[PDB]
Amino acid sequence: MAIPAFHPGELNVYSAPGDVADVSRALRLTGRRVMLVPTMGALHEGHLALVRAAKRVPGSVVVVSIFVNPMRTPDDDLAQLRAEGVEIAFTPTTAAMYPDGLRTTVQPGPLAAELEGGPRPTHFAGVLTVVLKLLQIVRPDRVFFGEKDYQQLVLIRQLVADFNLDVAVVGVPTVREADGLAMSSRNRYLDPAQRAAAVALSAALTAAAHAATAGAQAALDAARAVLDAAPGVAVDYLELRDIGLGPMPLNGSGRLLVAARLGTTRLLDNIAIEIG
């Protein structure tokens, strides 16, 4: 019942859930507002944008979890976080996260069966289960996700509302390459022809977002034409929904989402759309 060592203003690494839970609770008692940034593999600028967002809350202490599925290299990742002034990295093993194996889990609502839930019908159960655990271990005031995985973000908001969780969910605008391609660990697999064609996803969506003054059908036809101008872009879906991913209403706010396969690589993108 002694609190684990915490050195303020340094990067403190913990692998044990109980240690990070004790430190986060001790920190919340001393004033600090605990921010959580969940991550998975090699850190990229997308991830750094979540960190920076969390850093700007006055009195924040930022916790970055690094944990691979059951849903890169440790050296550089940790160097990057130190550089960002992150004070806690949580790096648990699979065994420490799942000491009893897979047992009680979260069952998403029917949204999880749609869109990405078509090829990966249990994917979102995994993500929601591990999010719930990280939220209970760290007990942050705010948790930060990219808007890139939009359906994921919406399901997370559903989790927080449905299970009455305390935490504020912050969606952070997707970081993009110079030509608009949304950042993703998958981008590096693309060969040159594929990387050149992949700019069609973001170009389609931004075209649709500007075509939308002319109504929903013009937005969708614009995105579709841009996708049709690209070779080797196999479109899995292109759907305009309302902001919670229900059916898009006659006018007002929506989201347009696309997924496509370029060779063996699946890419996704989405954008805010205002109808008329």
Ligand X SMILES: COc1ccc2c(c1)cc(CNC(=O)c1cc3ccccc3o1)n2CC(=O)O
Residues that are catalytic: 47
146 is in an annotated binding site: yes
Q: What's the number of CA atoms in the CB half-sphere (13 Å) around residue 21?
A: 11
Whether the CB-CB separation of 219 and 212 falls below 8 Å is answered with: yes
Q: Which residues contact 232 (CB under 8 A, 6 or more apart)?
A: 193, 194, 197, 262, 263
Whether the CB-CB separation of 270 and 255 falls below 8 Å is answered with: yes
Q: Considering the rule CB under 8 A, would residue 108 count as an interface residue with its own copies?
A: yes
Q: Considering the rule CB under 8 A, would residue 143 count as an interface residue with its own copies?
A: no
246 is in an annotated binding site: no
In the stretch 29-68, what mask flags binding to ligand X with x, by CB under 6 A? ---------xxx-----xx-xx------------------
**Residues 161-180 contacting ligand X, CB under 6 A:** 172, 174-175
**8-state DSSP, 175:** P
Distance CA 265, CA 148 (A): 16
Shortest Å, Cβ 163 to its own copies: 5
15 is in an annotated binding site: no
In the chain the first and final C-alpha atoms are separated, in Å, by 59
1 is in an annotated binding site: no
Residue of the chain from 91, 93, 158, 185 that contacts ligand X (CB under 6 A): 185
Q: Considering the rule CB under 8 A, would residue 259 count as an interface residue with its own copies?
A: no
Rounded to the nearest 10 degrees, how much is the dihedral formed by the CA atoms of 141, 146, 150, 154?
0
Q: Considering the rule CB under 6 A, would residue 80 count as an interface residue with ligand X?
A: no
Residue 175's binding partner among its own copies, ligand X, none (Cβ under 5 to 8 angstroms by kind) is ligand X
